[PDB]
Design a binder for this molecule. Structure first.
Ligand SMILES: *[C@@H]1O[C@H](CO)[C@@H](O[C@H]2O[C@H](CO)[C@@H](O[C@@H]3O[C@H](CO[C@H]4O[C@H](CO[C@H]5O[C@H](CO)[C@@H](O)[C@H](O)[C@@H]5O)[C@@H](O)[C@H](O[C@H]5O[C@H](CO)[C@@H](O)[C@H](O)[C@@H]5O)[C@@H]4O)[C@@H](O)[C@H](O[C@H]4O[C@H](CO)[C@@H](O)[C@H](O)[C@@H]4O[C@H]4O[C@H](CO)[C@@H](O)[C@H](O)[C@@H]4O)[C@@H]3O)[C@H](O)[C@H]2NC(C)=O)[C@H](O)[C@H]1NC(C)=O
Ligand SMILES: *[C@@H]1O[C@H](CO)[C@@H](O[C@H]2O[C@H](CO)[C@@H](O)[C@H](O)[C@H]2NC(C)=O)[C@H](O)[C@H]1NC(C)=O
Ligand SMILES: Nc1nc2c(ncn2[C@@H]2O[C@H](COP(=O)(O)OP(=O)(O)O)[C@@H](O)[C@H]2O)c(=O)[nH]1
Ligand SMILES: Nc1nc2c(ncn2[C@@H]2O[C@H](COP(=O)(O)OP(=O)(O)O)[C@@H](O)[C@H]2O)c(=O)[nH]1
Ligand SMILES: [Cl-]
Ligand SMILES: [Cl-]
Ligand SMILES: [Cl-]
Ligand SMILES: [Cl-]
Ligand SMILES: [Mn+2]
Ligand SMILES: [Mn+2]
Lengths: 335, 335
């Protein structure tokens, strides 16, 4: 029973939800995101919205969010076990790494940020509020949906048998994940059955797996099948990363973690790029380059700032790996 | 002889303007920024707005922009000598540098980006349209002004004799400026008279100038006195950088360039941090931390996402160098 075997069953309305991990003090930026989701798709195809916080939500936060969302909303606090140091982690060591990296890279000195990355990597998908669902669409605060979305995306994913959907890709700052690749490759050598014969390795590596090109999918935007994270393959991959310690001794983000897994554990035709969904998560945009799609969906983004084909993005690498025909003027973005 | 400050004191309604370098394809983001500036300050304290482009602006662009700005607007094209490779730059060497750095750092492979950095560093303050002014306020597309601004800021700079005003500070990616610091220190070594005896070196260095801590002020937001860039010290400095080659052989940004000059050539009390102006330039915010200021000006940002005192920001370094007392809750931003 392979990884896909755990996913194909979920292939009449799909069981799905939007999911948001957020802080009380980010209310204004969250309300702005909700307004975008509501006007661009949620009024048309309603799905419940799950809100998660490592601390309890204030009544002010809940009242404002409940009022702003038109479909059903659910608020949850996450378990102490999913947001706290594991017994095998040396906290004094973790504290020194933080202090030393405070000014070295973004969130380098942040204690809470690392707990968040670990949370998004191995726990959000098994929070009690997501168990009844098969699909989720992650939404962060201060986001923009630049265009109308006129079809149910979960329905679409379900009918087309897609597992992982994304919009923005990029090269990770390596100082942030020094030993992530080595750790992941050792896992695969130990568990060859988990490496799909038709995987997307070429997106992650230019040398047949020897080294990592640092490419990954942005995690702030994800529309995916929860059964992937719930598979033995992913569960065992996360546990290996957890025990190695990178989430705390380095600054492993959930994005490169979700990406390496999706790209290695699945037949590559299970991964999908929503070239049609206009989106912004500071500081980058995914703006539809197809004029018909851009105009029919009343996109509000400047096509000229689409990040997809810019050098530091991994859109080119993704297109070549999938054998997708890149848009006519894709090279302009490398100027 | 005549010092750097001798060139500025005379300018102490002031002759001022907003100034925007921008592309035709960034129209929607530009109009967005304009609406913010209009609503938060320009309709109350009108000042002329200058727009610049290395290419001619389209009629669609000028029409939309002319209508959106309530004060007088001026459109200008850049002299080609302020946006092209100087005769001493080896273009093949530069092309190779770009091709290699394409996927290494943001804008690594971009040719236009480097000309933009050189433009903001040594020429925007020489454009014909800025000749009649003593002050400028730089504004970029996709910006937000979170709060109302209830005083004329140029007037305030003049009356308070300030030269350089900013909102966000951050650590530069060293990979883009490997030899910038060394080039700058040699300049000072040969021109000790341009080093103000009461400067802000401590913001840039933790070891009395031996090395650069990489701190700089974000140039997308600047309210400054043009006469600073017009002074002999800055002209000579820019010329030194221009001949060293870094704008094209590395990826020198104008922000670090403007910052090293301001922090070394001026008495430190001439640099000013606008703790009261709410601002966002993807992906960081400057959000008024003072309650009365935040409320009185109806700020729209989440105080909890203020970047100022985050580790990777240089607000801490800035306050300590100026001797400004940091707000009580500054450490929370380091969690
Ligand atoms: C959990 O993680 C913990 C954190 O890593 C870890 O703690 C210990 O880790 C190792 C294990 O032994 C220790 O490493 C030794 O460090 C000695 C130097 O100690 C001093 O310097 C430390 C580093 O300072 C740097 O980093 C700081 C923060 O990052 C920074 O602030 C500072 O500016 C600087 O950049 C520093 O951390 C120490 O602080 C502690 O002590 C202070 C003074 O008492 C105190 O004020 C402070 O509060 C802390 O409590 C120290 O200041 C090295 O000298 C030593 O190296 C020698 O020994 C090794 C052993 O193999 C040799 O390989 C090496 O070559 C050296 O040997 C030469 O010298 C000996 C001397 O005779 C000679 O015999 C030999 O021939 C050689 O010539 C070694 O590197 C580390 O100090 C510990 N850290 C702390 C904070 O406790 C725990 O082990 C982890 N727990 C578990 C269960 O694994
Ligand atoms: C301008 O840059 C080019 C591109 O790097 C230089 O080309 C040479 O670079 C190496 C010499 O240092 C060698 O690989 C070759 O001599 C040559 N490379 C090729 C084939 O392009 C060139 O020397 C530079 N010219 C100047 C102005 O010094
Ligand atoms: N509850 C909670 N959510 C957090 C915390 N840190 C980050 N988040 C959320 O996790 C997501 C990613 O955080 P963000 O700060 O946007 O990280 P970035 O995208 O890397 O800049 C956002 O939805 C945040 O609101 C935290 O400490 N607690
Ligand atoms: N006219 C013109 N403006 C440019 C060009 N590249 C950047 N700019 C402007 O320079 C400023 C900084 O550019 P931006 O792309 O936002 O750079 P970033 O802030 O580093 O992400 C903005 O005002 C842009 O509109 C260019 O090629 N031509
Ligand atoms: Cl803990
Ligand atoms: Cl940070
Ligand atoms: Cl040229
Ligand atoms: Cl880029
Ligand atoms: Mn985010
Ligand atoms: Mn910008």
């Amino acid at each position: 029973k392979t990884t896909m075997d755990y996913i194909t069953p979920s292939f009449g309305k799909p069981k799905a939800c939007y999911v948001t991990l957020v802080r009380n003090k980010e209310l204004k930026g969250l309300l702005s995101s909700i307004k975008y989701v509501e006007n661009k798709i949620n009024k048309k195809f309603p799905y419940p919205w799950v809100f998660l916080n490592d601390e309890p939500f204030t009544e002010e936060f809940k009242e404002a969010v409940t009022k702003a969302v038109s479909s059903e909303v659910k608020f949850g606090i996450l378990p102490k076990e999913h947001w706290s140091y594991p017994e095998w982690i040396n906290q004094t060591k973790a504290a020194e790494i933080r202090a030393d990296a405070a000014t070295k890279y973004i969130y380098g000195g942040s204690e809470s940020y690392r707990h968040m990355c670990r949370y998004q990597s191995g726990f959000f998908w098994r929070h009690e509020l997501l168990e009844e669902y098969d699909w989720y669409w992650r939404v962060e605060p201060d986001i923009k949906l630049y265009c109308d979305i006129n079809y149910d995306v979960f329905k679409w994913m379900q009918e087309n048998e897609k597992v992982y959907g994304f919009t923005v890709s990029i090269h990770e700052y390596e100082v942030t994940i020094p030993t992530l690749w080595q750790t992941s490759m050792d896992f695969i050598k130990k568990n060859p059955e988990y490496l799909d014969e038709n995987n997307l390795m070429s997106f992650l590596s230019n040398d047949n797996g020897k080294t990592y090109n640092l490419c990954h999918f942005w995690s702030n935007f994800e529309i995916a099948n929860l059964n992937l994270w719930r598979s033995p393959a992913y569960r065992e991959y996360f546990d290996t990363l957890d025990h190695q310690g990178g989430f705390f001794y380095e600054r492993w983000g959930d994005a490169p973690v979700h990406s390496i897994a999706a790209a290695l554990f699945l037949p590559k035709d299970k991964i999908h790029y929503f070239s049609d969904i206009g989106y912004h998560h500071p500081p980058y945009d995914n703006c539809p380059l197809d004029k018909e799609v851009y105009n029919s969906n009343n996109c509000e983004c400047d096509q000229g700032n689409d990040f997809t084909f810019q050098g530091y993005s991994c859109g080119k690498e993704y297109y070549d790996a999938q054998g997708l025909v890149k848009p006519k003027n894709w090279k302009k973005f490398r100027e």
